[PDB]
Amino acid sequence: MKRMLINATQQEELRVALVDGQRLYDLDIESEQKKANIYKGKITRIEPSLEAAFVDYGAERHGFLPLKEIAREYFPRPNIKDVLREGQEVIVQIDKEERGNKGAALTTFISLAGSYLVLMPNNPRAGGISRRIRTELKEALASLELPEGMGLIVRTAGVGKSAEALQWDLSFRLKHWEAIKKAAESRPAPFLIHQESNVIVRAFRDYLRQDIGEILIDNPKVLELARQHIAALGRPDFSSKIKLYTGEIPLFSHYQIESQIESAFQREVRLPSGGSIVIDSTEALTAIDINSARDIEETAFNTNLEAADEIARQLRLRDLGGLIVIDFIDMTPVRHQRAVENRLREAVRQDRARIQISHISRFGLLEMSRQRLSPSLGESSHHVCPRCSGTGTVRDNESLSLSILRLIEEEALKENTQEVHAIVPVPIASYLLNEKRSAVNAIETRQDGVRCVIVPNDQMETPHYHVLRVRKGEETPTLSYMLPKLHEE
Amino acid sequence: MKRMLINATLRVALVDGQRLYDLDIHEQKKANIYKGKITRIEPSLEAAFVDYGAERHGFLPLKEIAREYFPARPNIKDVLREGQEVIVQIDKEERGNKGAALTTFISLAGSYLVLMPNNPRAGGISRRIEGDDRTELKEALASLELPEGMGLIVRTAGVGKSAEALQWDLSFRLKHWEAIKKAAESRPAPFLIHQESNVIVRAFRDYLRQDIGEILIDNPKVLELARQHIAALGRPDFSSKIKLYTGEIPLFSHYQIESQIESAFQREVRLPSGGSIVIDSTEALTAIDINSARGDIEETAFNTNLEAADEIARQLRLRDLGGLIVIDFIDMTPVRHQRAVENRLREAVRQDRARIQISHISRFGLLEMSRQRLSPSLGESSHHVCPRCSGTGTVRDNESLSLSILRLIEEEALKENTQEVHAIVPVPIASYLLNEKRSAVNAIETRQDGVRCVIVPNDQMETPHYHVLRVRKGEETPTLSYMLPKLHEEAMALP
Amino acid sequence: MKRMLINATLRVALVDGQRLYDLDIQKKANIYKGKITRIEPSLEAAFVDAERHGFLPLKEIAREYFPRPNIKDVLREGQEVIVQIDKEERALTTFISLAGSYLVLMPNNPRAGGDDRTELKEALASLELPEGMGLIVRTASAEALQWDLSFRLKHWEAIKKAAESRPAPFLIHQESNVIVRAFRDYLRQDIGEILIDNPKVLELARQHIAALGRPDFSSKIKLYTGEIPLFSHYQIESQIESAFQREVRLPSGGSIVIDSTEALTAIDINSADIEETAFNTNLEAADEIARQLRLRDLGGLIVIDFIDMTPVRHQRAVENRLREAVRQDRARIQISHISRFGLLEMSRQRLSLGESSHHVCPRCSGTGTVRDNESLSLSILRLIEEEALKENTQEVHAIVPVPIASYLLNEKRSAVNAIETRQDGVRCVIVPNDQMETPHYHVLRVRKGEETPTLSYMLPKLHEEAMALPSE
Amino acid sequence: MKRMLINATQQLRVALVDGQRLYDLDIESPGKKANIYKGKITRIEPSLEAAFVDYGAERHGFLPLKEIAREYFRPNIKDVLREGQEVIVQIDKEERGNKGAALTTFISLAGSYLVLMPNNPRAGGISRTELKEALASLELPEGMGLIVRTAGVGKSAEALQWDLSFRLKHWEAIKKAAESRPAPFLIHQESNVIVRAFRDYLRQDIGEILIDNPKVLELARQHIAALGRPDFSSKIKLYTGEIPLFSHYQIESQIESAFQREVRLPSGGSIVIDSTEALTAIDINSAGDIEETAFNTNLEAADEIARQLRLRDLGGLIVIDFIDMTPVRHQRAVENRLREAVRQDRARIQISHISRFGLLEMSRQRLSHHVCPRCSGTGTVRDNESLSLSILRLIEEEALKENTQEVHAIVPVPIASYLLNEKRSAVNAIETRQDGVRCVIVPNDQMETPHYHVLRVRKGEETPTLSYMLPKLH
Ligand SMILES: [Zn+2]
Ligand SMILES: [Zn+2]
């Protein structure tokens, strides 16, 4: 059975997992974003000067509706003064967030994005397959039963799919649209109809499919809200599937996903056979290295296939974006390289994100790209990494040392210098005073009379250090290792 | 003017003429050349033993003796006399018990050429060199004046130079080879003729070309050794060009190269126009990102990429970067820019001695390339991915992290047949779990009646890392809590 | 009065007046009535109903249940049977064995039974054992044995009475609940009361007594109710605290010092007529040491440095004191003489696994003395050079404590350089290691050819297997 | 080959070395008593029944009548001695205050095991069953007597004969050097630190004595002739290499082994030398056949222990926990191995067997830095268990106090681990019995294992500080 588990025992913090069995196969972790919210709005005032109008959609500031955005449905080359009345009600969607002094950009041409489809129930003039894409898709799109007054777009996401699966998405957009206009026809004008960005409506919109057997929710107050959204989205057949979790063992722990979730935070994730993948992220790209466990050709082939599967889901769970480079283990047969490519392609087939994959090159690398799905490059409860001090780069022991070494010498050059104390972490004092002993001696012999003291301090770690200057006369007879305390002041 | 500055108060920098364009900064024997006397012959091993000086005798198998020592499949007893003198090179250093592998087939490696003055049967362009590169090299090599009884090899390094530049390299090997057999004809048998690895001998062997005007040296004791090496290498035309630096301002500071040397240790290197390159290194490869400055867009991207290609080439030399390199060039829409950026990189690396191979800008806008670190020294990549992060700059809080491990613990304890669950966590995590969350740790144990939850503080880990191990019924040991990290040492280990 | 105090607010203390003389702080050998699930002539065994069925091989069926044969001939499916667990779930026998302190009754089967043994072979022949059964005398007098043998017989009766009174699947006897063990190990005829401070436990305590088959005792189990804690009211809490001290004061004023080393436990004896003092303090020591061995649960080898005595008759009297003082200890104990050096060597078998109170400082060899860093460095510094002089040496790695590396590579940097320069080509690597402290270090020699490009600070790990100690 | 190496380039160390096994060391560093002179009788005092002797000090020595040998003879001192009479004289007591030194013509030559009184036979004997048998077997000249030292517990008769004869050879040379000169000079210097080494460390099997210092080597030969053995002058040799003597002979590390707690054995096992209040416990760990390994490590142990006792100068009571051996014949062979290997030692040694417990007891007579952080300078550190239990009772005692809100136990990491796992139950028990009192046990990687803290937090003073942030706060 496929389940959607929703762990919501922090009422600010929120987790949604899809699960075939114990395949965690997709995850999301959530809760302002306002783009693509739908309101009923009253027209505040008309401006023939800007060929536009102003809409009270509930916000403290009025939205902005240009003429090019008004549907023929609301037209009772024309002046806007001839098209709209003041105080006229209108179903309105946000194109662009409020910026600076400027109210949100609003359009009546409403668009309902699904997983694979974007229904424009309001205008039929937009539609077709995307530029980014198509032979079977042009055949599958013509087969869907679309009402006459509307148009649809098939998202890059729609490409490895079937027509049967598209009809399921298209109909979920239709049921929603009915309810949008049903909840508009039922009220006075200033209110909100659809929230793009709250986590239940988004979870159902993105994560629901026909193969989903249950939706377990561990919080009653939420489960009630979850029902309401399902009827507003126009799918009662799902209410029966929504079920309340009540056990005292936590939802995600009862189903054994909490560790799999934990794997999306790790540098190294283990593969089923015993190998692993190491996910490093640079300024330019994300590098994924692959290591095997403890026939060589069969091992490399086997570990790569597992790697291809793990990388795929890690890309979903982590929500990784941009450029990705996979260093697959070397394989001599070309047929293996194809099978490792085709593994990865099938594994990323279920990913909603726009993903593009090349081959295994002559250097044994695979390049690919993924579009990060959410605007919020953000992390619910985190802090700056201390060791890298916020940037993701840690200075090699070589260069750190070399850097302090030039820094010591610059202090020894200064006039009136008696001594210079470098208080460094232990490995650095080890590297400086052995590997670089020659250069340490070179400084002291060139700065005749200047004491270079490099003291290993097990109280520091490797980004941190100190280089202190001791002027002629203020030197003490303190022992090298008792200095870190001395300079505690 | 081009100078070779040598700071030895050992660092060697090539300076045009206040710009710094190349830098160079283990008791070595492989590829030393001796005159040797034959100690004793072994027809049983089809080999002989040679006294080249060392406390242990070298090993010269029959397959290594040149026809120069032959008359007309023979027994080695018919070939050599005991105590017969012979010019000998070390193939392989002394390992364990054996003395050193020796061959009479001498080879003199230059920058671009390896002269085998001893045997003509082994020369040509190597297989590493792709056809379109080699095409002109097969033409340039046929044009060099090589004496009859000897053969050459064009190193992968030869790849970007000209026939006029190769003729300069080949002649330096010839001048040396002469002196090698002149110093051998002039003495009894047991001595050393050529030392492969003086940093002076190496610097001249690797870094001299006809375009080098001066060789400033700031150390007298070394300058004298430098002249001797020049005469021993057989090039008196360069003695005049070796000069003593004397100024009180350090050699490298007078020429303003010290900061440029400092750049080979930086993560981000400013380009001339304002943009930069970010050199990150990972486990697998070296990622280089390119950023631009501050207004034609296409021109900026093109122009920044060109500067990048030039900076990356020299940084690859100065850093001595090895292995796999991925360059993320700024995106360019015209294909003609993408070829120009590639060709910029090819012409910029053309003077690197290292074997370099460069592909195209792919559909993703990446350039893959490889480079051999030249030095037995294993290269430390200037910077690299933070291990606490994986290079996010972000780390989970201790609370969210404990709560996460909490449920992870309980998930393990709920598994059938579980006796114990061991959480090996960083010290402040065990502190938080076993104090602030003690109640909840107790709740697990009391709900999983019989399952021991062991949360052990481990001062060997820090805060993103942890471990949650499951102990099945019957395989628990009476080990103390604080001694579990050391016992699980075996397992918890990541490939 | 001898009491058994049970603090369960689980600790069990045997207390004579106000003297603490003993202290205590799985499914093998549990007994059930079981129904035979199904028979297997193939494995010559049967299955007995836990969520999983037990396994009863033919060799384990008593002659009592057979009304060389096949297992299908002996047993009927669904036949009830008194069953004991031989081995935990990873084995059932119908030979049952009831272990006491001194005796293991095999009430089912008499083909059992088991040269300090001279009086034991006589004492065992004197016990009144029913015909159909045999017994084993554990490693742990005849009058004291008859008390133990009868408590097993009382128990066995109740076991077959609780089986004759019910349907077939249930548990009869639980081998291991600390109350069962305390009554099994720590009950005797001379125990007047068993005070318990916890009602929930006292109730469980009574049930275990009737199950153990001794209703005469229920009267002697009493509930403690005072607000002053049970152990404090009886003044044993300090004596319990003495089991954790290095030095325990003797009645007369002398003391014993209990040190423990790697090999053994050294007990020294100090005092407060010289001959009479030594003799008398030694007698007091033999008493204290005996009960300290019980309270601490000390195991293995014990050497006792008694105060020296010149008359041989005192030495025997101090031995025989110690022998009779340990007589009540459950553990297997063996005692030798006071040797010509005035030591007494003895051994004790720790009853369950465990360790001791104080042992000897790793930092010293047990002195308190520790060489100054200056002297310690200079020592290592001459040691390093000694290694670099050796023929065929490529490198020499000093792995020293952090302050020693700091002293060596700063204050003594000149000398370190002097070694490297006089030993042309030999690398001195002095690595600071925050895993060591200051008496300890290592100086390792790296022959020509076997050097690795390992980083100075990573050597400690590369050298683990070769720098570890046969001590551990 | 057994050698005596003498390092004297440094201002003096003497090491007995067998092959390259340092087995004895002396570091005599010289700041009285038993010097021998030829002396002229300055003046006689019948008043004090004594005389005055010129032994060449600026002050005359004092020779009572009771100290004059029958050889030089109730009488007056005036009747026995003639003024200006020459006499072989030994110092009894160093010069004190105004008096000159006490002198006796009863002369005694101390060796390692024997004191020869070549002058008087009336003093000697014991106070042992075999020593009384062994002393009666020695060939001692009529006119003289001998004492067996406390050392001489550990002498064979053949070994005693070697000591006695070295005293006799010396005594001959003493009177030979007296007969050959006028009267005021010094004959034998007891104390000049080379004399001790030759007196304690020389024997017939010493091939060479290498000395790295000329000034000292000259002094070393004079002392040999004065000790009366010119046959050795040829065996004393000047070391000259730039490599220090003790480093050329590879013994400097073996000298440094005497300071360690564990010493590795040749085969790979080791011995652990731990010293308590009562005794020295030596434990033995091993590195195929198990019976052969245990036997073979124990043999090496016995050998190593023997010389460690010598190098360390351990004294008193020693208990050796040999690796268990089931065969009784090995037990005897490990015993006999120890006995033979201490046979060289100069100290008084006694050895029992391997007991039923597998332990060997033995005693040795001793022949002649800064407070440890970790045990506060006593013998003992606590077990993590006992320490934890100790802190645990201490935590509860703080929680009992009136007006307590919290009790913070700042312990080392392994202690926090043991307390909060193995003892978690008891930690809960305190908190639940002290309703409302928070027990905070915080692991602190800044401390190690003897140290800790238990702090009390009164009601109202508690902060919202995180557990692990409490070390810093405090
Ligand atoms: Zn980081
Ligand atoms: Zn200590």
Author numbering:
A (entry chain A): 1 to 31, 35 to 79, 87 to 143, 148 to 308, 314 to 508
B (entry chain B): 1 to 9, 14 to 29, 34 to 80, 87 to 308, 313 to 513
C (entry chain D): 1 to 9, 14 to 29, 36 to 59, 62 to 79, 87 to 109, 115 to 138, 146 to 171, 176 to 307, ...
D (entry chain C): 1 to 11, 14 to 33, 37 to 78, 87 to 140, 148 to 307, 313 to 393, 401 to 506
Paper text:
Here, we present the first crystal structure of the E. coli RNase E catalytic domain in the apo form at 3.3 Å resolution. The quaternary structure of the RNase E apoprotein is composed of a dimer-of-dimers connected via the small domains but has substantial deviations from the D2 symmetry observed in the holoprotein. Specifically, each is twisted by about 45° in the apoprotein relative to its orientation in the holoprotein, and the tetramer is bent out of the plane by ∼40°. Two zinc ions are present in the structure, one in each pocket. In each of the four apoprotein protomers, the combined S1 subdomain and 5′ sensor (from here on referred to collectively as the “5/S1 subdomain”) has moved as a single unit through an angle of about 60° relative to the holoprotein configuration. This conformational change significantly exposes both the binding and catalytic sites to the surrounding solvent and probably permits substrates to be more easily bound to the enzyme. Additional electron density was identified in the 5′ sensing pocket in three of the four monomers. On the basis of the coordination geometry and the buffer composition, we propose that this density is likely to be a sulfate ion. This ion is hydrogen-bonded to the T170 side chain and amide group, as well as to the R169 side chain, mimicking the interaction between RNase E and the 5′-monophosphate group of RNA seen in the holoprotein structure. In the structure presented here, these residues are oriented as in the previously reported holoprotein, but no electron density was apparent near the catalytic sites, suggesting that the metal may be absent.
